[PDB]
Amino acid sequence: SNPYQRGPNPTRSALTTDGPFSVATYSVSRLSVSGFGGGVIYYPTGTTLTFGGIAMSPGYTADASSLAWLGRRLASHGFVVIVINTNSRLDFPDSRASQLSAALNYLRTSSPSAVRARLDANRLAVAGHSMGGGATLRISEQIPTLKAGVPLTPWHTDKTFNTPVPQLIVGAEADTVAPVSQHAIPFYQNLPSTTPKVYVELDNATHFAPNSPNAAISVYTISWMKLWVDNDTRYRQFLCNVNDPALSDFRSNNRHCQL
C-alpha cells in the first residue's frame, strides 16, 4: 500500500483535463517574500490528504500567468504548486534556479497555513519553461533530494548537468528559439547515464507550446511527477512502450519502467 497514492486509477484521457481535486489559488505578492518575485500557489481543497510540492519557473520576460494552466493542471491532479514571478523579467537560468530554491523554502515554511496543511514538505519537484527549463536542470544539480524535474523546451548555455534527480525533458521539434539539437537533446544526453531520464519531442511544435494547454505536455508532466513525487507506479504505463501521435520522438534509458 503506497501512502502517497492519490486519485483513481489513471487513463491517458484523464491526464488531458484538470484532475479530480478541487483547487484553491493564493497570490504571493512581490513585496511579501524575499529571494524571488512572488507568484501564484495552486493547491488542493476539499481534502484531508497531503501532497508533494512543485515549483515552476517561467521563461525570459514571462510571469507566472504564462504557466497558470499547467500549475492548475498539476495541482488538480494532487500537488501543491507554486508558479513564480522572478525578481527581474530578464533573469537568466541560474538566477531562476536560485529563485526556485527560495520559492520552495517559502512554500515549505512561510506560505499560508492552508497551503502548508496540504503539503508534504519533503516530497518536492521542479519544472519550468525555456530559461526556466534551464533553471530546472540547474536546481536539480544543486538540490539532489528533489524528486523530479520537468524542463519544458529548455534553454541554457551550459549543456551538462550532474544530477541524480530524474528528468523528463520536453522538446519542441520545430523550435527555433531553443533548437532541440542544441538545447533539449544535449541536456538529455549529458545527464548521468545512471539518472532516470526521458526525452519527449512534440511533433511539429514550436518554442511557446508550453504556455498554452497542451495534452501531451499534460500527460507526460503529470505522469513523471506522479511516478517520482508519489512513487505512483500506476503512471509507468504512460511512460513505457510509448507510441503517441503527438510525438516525433521519445527516448529513454528506461530505468523508470521497473523497480
From TrEMBL:
- The record's EC number reads 3.1.1.101
What superkingdom heads the lineage? Bacteria
Keyword tags:
Hydrolase
| The keyword Hydrolase is annotated on this UniProt entry | yes
Name of the featured protein: Poly(Ethylene terephthalate) hydrolase
Which source organism?
bacterium HR29
